[PDB]
């Protein structure tokens, strides 16, 4: 149907926006601490601690499969990256502090993204 095509154009446009948002957020992780899944070879007990791991590469995979239907779903995954890190790692670690900085800086990008998604009506 034409409606289904219209919907898919919207989703494709959302994906384009979210890809821009994702690139901006990853730029706030210059140390690339959140670039890849935590290695279960390097941290064998990780899944005892963290029940829903997340990272930028996993997000990108979901993104390119157009698996984010709305900004909220994307934000949930970004929040998982930060929140998992701030639980597993203690306050006085380079890992925890990197998550705090990414959260604070990322907030700026997500604030405007929400306005853009609302404005261009992508949901
Ligand atoms: C995202 C996060 O929480 N990290 C980064 C990956 N980690 C790690 C530990 C040992 C060797 C290599 C990497 C654990 C802390």
Supply database-style keywords:
123 residues, mainly alpha, Histone Acetyltransferase, Chain A, 0% strand, binds 1-(4-phenylpiperazin-1-yl)ethan-1-one, Bromodomain-containing protein 1, gene regulation
CATH fold name, please? Histone Acetyltransferase, Chain A
Please tell me the total number of domains: 1
Give the CATH level 1 class: Mainly Alpha
Distance between the termini: 19 Å
The percent of residues in helical segments reads: 55-70%
- DSSP strand count: 0
Full CATH superfamily name:
Bromodomain-like
Topology as H/E string? HHHHH
Biggest β-sheet description: none
Structural class, please?
mainly alpha
Shape: elongated
- Radius of gyration over C-alpha positions, nearest whole angstrom: 16 Å
* Bound small-molecule species: 1-(4-phenylpiperazin-1-yl)ethan-1-one
CATH A-level architecture: Up-down Bundle
Number of helices: 5
Report strand %: under 5%
PDB class: gene regulation
Keywords: bromodomain, gene regulation
Assembly: monomeric
Entry title: PanDDA analysis group deposition -- Crystal Structure of BRD1 in complex with N10908a
């Amino acid at each position: 149907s034409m409606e289904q095509v219209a919907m898919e154009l919207r989703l494709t446009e959302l994906t384009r926006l979210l890809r821009s948002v994702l690139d901006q957020l990853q730029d706030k992780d210059p140390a690339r601490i959140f670039a890849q899944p935590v290695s279960l070879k390097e941290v064998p007990d990780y899944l005892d601690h963290i029940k829903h791991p997340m990272d930028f590469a996993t997000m990108r995979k979901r993104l390119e499969a157009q698996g984010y239907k709305n900004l909220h779903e994307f934000e949930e995954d970004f929040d998982l990256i930060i929140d998992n890190c701030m639980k597993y790692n203690a306050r006085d670690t380079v890992f925890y502090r990197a998550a705090v900085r990414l959260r604070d800086q990322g907030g700026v990008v997500l604030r405007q993204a929400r306005r853009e998604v609302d404005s261009i009506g992508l949901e």
